[model samples]
Target: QESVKEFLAKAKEEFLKKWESPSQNTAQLDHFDRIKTLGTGSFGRVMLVKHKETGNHYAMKILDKQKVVKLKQIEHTLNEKRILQAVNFPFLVKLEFSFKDNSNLYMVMEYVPGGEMFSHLRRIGRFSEPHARFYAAQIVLTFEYLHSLDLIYRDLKPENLLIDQQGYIQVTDFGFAKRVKGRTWTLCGTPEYLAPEIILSKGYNKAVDWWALGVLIYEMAAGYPPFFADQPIQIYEKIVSGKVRFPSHFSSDLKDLLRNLLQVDLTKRFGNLKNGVNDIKNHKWFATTDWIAIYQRKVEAPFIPKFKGPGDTSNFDDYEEEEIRVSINEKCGKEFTEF
Candidate 1:
């Protein structure tokens, strides 16, 4: 029998081989038939595409080169592709292949049949405590893996978390993610989910992700974020003030967890403490969590989407198709040649 190290080395070699030799057609956009527009973003859109030869469905993210250049997002865009390539986990979406044409860059990823977790949350108003715990536990594991690599998931909201066919979490957006060694000062992320340090323009690290997790947990349990106002500035004011009004239905354990997670002081944050992620993982709220089962995806998901097949797009909302007219000049196009 092979030792664990030998097995891991063999697996790594096989994985690299698979990535190195993608089908010839995968390099061309024409090889895939666009089935539906899955979602839209500031720079471009995500489409559900079907590979002709493999008959496999994939979510193709199309980014307008000009928009990406204009917004000065070339670094973040490239970083997203790099991080997606480096990561492989059950709770994280996988990038199959990437290709680019004259005007746009495309990243083909596994098409998670179930749509955004936000849509599901909206439909149900809020998740039961147990359901929220299950999703949160998976996210904690995801963060553990990412943080080990020194990657900070700057954005962690329900909108960025996609539900897969098995109802497991598949984090999708990495536009704001970065491989931060110590700290970064970029002011990004959704208004409601922003940590106080981020809103205050202080240099922050992976601790911000844990804070967002607290906001996500709060949103899932209460149907809204703890800090909300008419404008982003007002929301920031609330976040900086660090007052969370728990719903009457919230349990003491959950409130305790949120309080620790939502702490304005970085030193006091649960995930940033001496024990790191273990503190959050072993919190009272997650006392009954079967972490190994969650990591294996063996725990029964509380809500699985009813989709016909892998190519199904019914769970996603339809968007108006916009004309793809953005074009970058030759000088600007050089920046994206790596794709």
Candidate 2:
């Protein structure tokens, strides 16, 4: 095997972790001492927490089963748990424990305190070319690993993406995640980053993610989604026709890369994951990148984020917790099932 292929193999081997089957009740709440709510979502809310005995800090993703069933987002939630459990790299979010509350499913995992990529982008205005390349490279490597297993991460918006301690981006919220190696016809993904095939309701492969990558790069530079239509139909039209305009300050290289990524013709696009990353890497915009160091996770990024002790979320944006009236429908207790 080539050195790149060999390193990729070793990286993947070191990264994959065994998945533990949680009981039907979900997140063994007994392990976590509930702290404060991290953020809320369609299925449920995530809480910043610490282990009761060991005092280890972690993020507990709590999902109300009723909401899960109501919104029909259970498959996405389950898929995320499975995919995250399979990926154990330091660059990826780690799953620590799984269990449940009376009416909630819990997934306690490593807490990345760097916050979402959205705030980071807003703070910096825009990343330097090399810095953006570094982030894009990390995600490309991640996508490659997932693609190798025939999976496709359809969601790639800035809000759903995360930044780590080293200022590198790690993808989060695989709620729209699915494997599309051979066949998939899901009319999903955020509108701004939606690939043409997805908007057209045609079958798409993992290459659709590369399309989103192009849209993401555009947004990073322009600070707005490419197709700025208030309605989905108009946005879908622009996406299908690959109609896009760049900011006056944008460079030729950025335009070229985006054009290639947004090409609606799958057969005439940037080959595949490796080819696409290589194409973007080779662009003059990333003229001075050390791609090797990034894949090895040895590159020092521009930002070193601050994270407080596990349950200490004083640095985060404040919020109000809704009175989540959960009835002890089954084992009515002041306690949770043992893990």
Candidate 3:
């Protein structure tokens, strides 16, 4: 029987060993055979690709260099690569390799067979308490690990979380993630999950993530966000008001936990309190949880994703393949030379 700390240390050591030792075969675009388009965005598309050398499947995220430069996301794009390379956690998506061509930057990652949590949540409407607790516990651990590294995952939503075949969470899309030692003033994140400090343009730290966790937990068990409206402004209004209406189905412990997490005052928030993340880990709602067992994945997940195999793209929504276009000049291309 190993402690969580011991297991994490071993995991980190193994990850470093593999990361430091370069493979004999260098990765390139030609080495992978594209299977299907898993997702598309303004930056580029995520495709299911099978490596010709090892016959292993990976999700190749191809980002248009010109689009990245035009959108002034050079820093964020570079930071995403840096952070992905630096961290290796079970709940976080793993980046296998990153390379670039003249027109695009490619990031090959382990193919998470299950699709987005958004698809399952929407299909099921709302998750039961046990189901939501299972995922929420993993998120709490993910945040704890990231926060310890002084990294803040600004974007927290169902779409950003991928469920694996084993039903564990694999967080994806670090476009908005940043490593900050102190408060950051950037106003970014889904409006519904934004904290009051973010909506008010106040300098905020990791506490905002705790606030989003509150919104996520509520959304998981309630089918909708605590603060919702037709317009973004109205949602902000409701968020600033700090009035969360709970359905009768919510138990007292659950409500207490959300209240602590969604507190308008950062000083009072659970994760940011004096005890830090322990305040959350030891919350009444999670009193029965064994932190080590959760980290070890000994506790069974409530929903294991149904997929044919590792290369299955059935869980992901299909998108039309957009033609790769180069709109930026040579000067813009130099910005991504580090990639």
**Minimal lDDT window, size 10, model 3:** 17-26
Give one digit per residue, the lDDT tens place, for model 3 in 1-339.
256567656656654564355232237888988788898887778989999989999998889877888887898887777677768787999989887766778888888989999999999999999899999999999998878667899999999999997899999988888888998998888999999999889999999999999999999999998998999989999998868899999999999999999999888888998888889988889987887788889988888899999977889887886655444444355697666
lDDT of all the models against the reference? 0.85, 0.70, 0.86
| Clash count (model 3, backbone only) | 0
TM-score of each: 0.91, 0.86, 0.92
Question: For residues 133-250, what per-residue lDDT tens digits would candidate 1 score against the true structure?
Answer: 9999999988887776678988898888998878899999888888788989998899999998988888899999999999999999999989989998799899999688999999
lDDT of 2: 0.70
The whole-model C-alpha lDDT of candidate 1 against the native structure comes to: 0.85
For model 3, the superposed segments whose C-alpha errors exceed 4 Å read: 1-26, 325-331
Candidate 3 lDDT for residue 22: 29
Clashes of each: 0, 6, 0
| Cα lDDT tens digits for candidate 2, 144-250 | 66766566888888776666666676666666777554979867777778888877778788888888888777777777778878898888888887578888788
Flag regions of model 1 displaced more than 4 Å.
1-26, 325-331
The per-residue C-alpha lDDT of model 1 at residue 40 equals 90
Cα deviation of 171 in candidate 2 (Å)? 2.2
